[PDB]
Ligand binder design. Sequence first.
Ligand SMILES: [Mg+2]
Lengths: 43, 48, 112, 120
Amino acid sequence: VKRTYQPNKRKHSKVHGFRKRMSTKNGRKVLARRRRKGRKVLS
Amino acid sequence: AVPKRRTSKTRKNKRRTHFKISVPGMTECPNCGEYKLSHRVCKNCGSY
Amino acid sequence: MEAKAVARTIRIAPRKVRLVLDLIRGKNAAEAIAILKLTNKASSPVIEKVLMSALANAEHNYDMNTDELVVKEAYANEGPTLKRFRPRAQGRASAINKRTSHITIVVSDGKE
Amino acid sequence: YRKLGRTSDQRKAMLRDLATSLIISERIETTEARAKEVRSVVEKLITLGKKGDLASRRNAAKTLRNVEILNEDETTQTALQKLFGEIAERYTERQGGYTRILKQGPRRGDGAESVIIELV
RNA sequence: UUAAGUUAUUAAGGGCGCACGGUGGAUGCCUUGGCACUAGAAGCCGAUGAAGGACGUUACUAACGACGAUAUGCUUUGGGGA
RNA sequence: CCGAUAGUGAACCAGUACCGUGAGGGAAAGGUGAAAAGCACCCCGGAAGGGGAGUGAAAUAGAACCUGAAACCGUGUGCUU
RNA sequence: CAAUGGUAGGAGAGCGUUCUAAGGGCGUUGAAGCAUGAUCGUAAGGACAUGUGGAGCGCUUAGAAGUGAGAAUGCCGGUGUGAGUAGCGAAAGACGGGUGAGAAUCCCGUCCACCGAUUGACUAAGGUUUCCAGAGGAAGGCUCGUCCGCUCUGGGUUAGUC
RNA sequence: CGCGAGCUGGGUUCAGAACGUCGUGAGACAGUUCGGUCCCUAUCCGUCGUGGGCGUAGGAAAUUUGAGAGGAGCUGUCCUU
RNA sequence: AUGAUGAGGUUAAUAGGUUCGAGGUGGAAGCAUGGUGACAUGUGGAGCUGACGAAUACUAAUCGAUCGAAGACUUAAU
Ligand SMILES: [Mg+2]
């Protein structure tokens, strides 16, 4: 059966990805929390 | 269809009283003196 | 007097190794070897080798010649188990315990 | 008779193939059950060979596979020709037997009693 | 000898004690790291390109520090001592 | 105040394994010895192991390495059935 | 001389664990833990001896508390029982030769069988090194394994026109 | 109102729908109507078969009595008298 | 089901094969004749024939191993 997450590099990097989070202030937030947390993969 | 209770060590060891391997049907080989299975060809020599 | 030989972390579940050792307990060395080499089980090759080592140990370390040796006592006890899983149905996973065995054999001359 | 844990078409095929291979090699290694069941087939083929008339040749062609043996000096001849020219003569005077069976110890991968079926 | 009567033995295995092994990681002891504070500094970093990264850099080479194409470091002034 | 199920989530390459499309969620894991002196050689084995000899105060301190409980699994047996 | 069953519950006296203050002590001539024992007190519990153990720990008085577990379909970690039971995930294999410590399971060969609008050839998306040649066998392969999409070593992707 | 870890699932008692009736309404009625996922690898006792051990004062091969126990146990028509 | 039960292990018919037969099927192959051919006829109730009946050691039950008594007291008759 068709399950979820039919992977796609382009959409993955479009809906997510550094420049997309840097396009909205709320996007800028999640990077802020992820650095405060010391995350290694930020977007 | 599930065990209503534990099988104690006593019951366990009791059930497996008859669960054992038998010593092989081995006889001495007439050409080499090493043991072989009866009615089989000796694997050390290769006789009868 | 007594020669020792041990095999550790053998990859056979101890319930299965003990079935073969329940035959060579207290028999002579030659008869014991003939049993192992002819019993058609999985553990048998690995035990025939622990016995072999004991007997070699006896000759090379005590001058205990192999014609008079008897497996004084031979046993097997649990070892460091390896834990694995099997993907079963409806997303559930069941466990599989790959067990091991610490095989011991001591052969004696019956003497002091 | 025995079924050998197998269907009818797959057994018919296995029995005839095993008989052919025996005829090629004159002694093979297999499990007891299949030796006990190829015994009769190979014995009956040799009977079809002890007559050599064209009818028996044509009829034995049913069972044997078509194989080629390279003899000494690069001489070539098929299973039918072997059966009717090199094995008919050997057993012209014997009135049965044609095969023996020598049990061997169990194999490793299973507990199957391997045996060697050989043309006597 | 025969009648009548009575009673061992057995242990395939089990139980209880005891001895000796394994498995396992409690406990005891220990500290590299934490927690709560006190006293005094300090309480702005960015277009002079920040904070955070990515790639790199060694004799050989992955990781971690350090470093940046002058890269596992360069200069200088002082401290020191194989 | 805490001594490794505690004390930070994190004493140990931890916001890391890992999980989620993503916000996010989020572990488990310290201890050989004083010194590495980390077991020259020999023996069985293809090897893993082992058994001697040697190192060391100690090697049931041999690297999964301090102490090593209980559940649990064995091998003997004195008394029973 | 009288009293002493007891649940919700009230009252009193106490036993134990960690730490602190002071005093007095014990410790490689072997501390704490651990194990055993046929010992002592009315109880919570306290000693003694013998083994393992290889450095800390008792006693008196008094202070403080993360102070006492058997149950919460409690949490974490180990190990059981069901049991040598169910399962071994659509299918055709047989045999000769070789390789090895070991072979139904690896290599070669013959025969046989299955697909064949496809289990065949391409190419996208996606995965990223699984690709190739040597070597290995702990682990992963639902068995075995000398084999491999596994491990170790060294390699491999070449565009003016796709 | 024996028996669903032996079976079915038509009725009834989930979510859909529809008619009559009641309710302004959401909805309702033991009023109808069409449709509607029946899981479980048997540990113990029990029961039907089938083995091994031991005891029956020696070790054996065969034939046995029967203390008990179980199974059967029904009945029609015609003719004759 | 397995184990048991039963028929046998060479001083042997237990099973296989060989030979003969029962039963089943129904006119094998190759020839010759006739037909343009599709075919037909004689050989020849032929050929084939798993379990069913009998004979025959031709092949396999070759070699060997393990378990298994020495008989209690007491009393009464003998
Ligand atoms: Mg799934």
